[PDB]
């Protein structure tokens, strides 16, 4: 198997209002991302001949 990593999708940031200043959301919500994994594998093709 080969398991390369795929980067997660983009995150929007928050537009904070005037009244959340010096508050704790004045820095928005958190952009959480989660790397994901893709797998590569093989199958077999085969043949026989007899002379």
């Amino acid at each position: 198997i080969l398991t390369m990593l795929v980067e997660p999708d983009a995150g929007k940031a928050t537009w904070v209002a005037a009244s959340t200043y010096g508050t704790d959301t004045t820095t928005g919500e958190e952009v959480k991302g989660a790397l994901k994994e893709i797998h590569f594998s093989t199958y077999k093709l085969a043949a026989k001949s007899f002379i």
Partner: protein
């Protein structure tokens, strides 16, 4: 796994070659972020 032969790898993690390559799609071209100029403001 690959248990075909006498002698087999223990977990299939000793099989896979984990890679550390990261890939991102065509990803929405961001057209309108920079088309317009800036007024560097210094007040509300």
């Amino acid at each position: 796994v690959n248990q075909s032969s006498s002698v087999e790898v223990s977990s299939e993690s000793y099989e896979t070659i984990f890679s550390q390559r990261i890939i991102r799609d065509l990803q929405k071209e961001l057209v309108v972020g920079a088309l317009f100029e800036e007024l560097p403001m210094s007040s509300k």
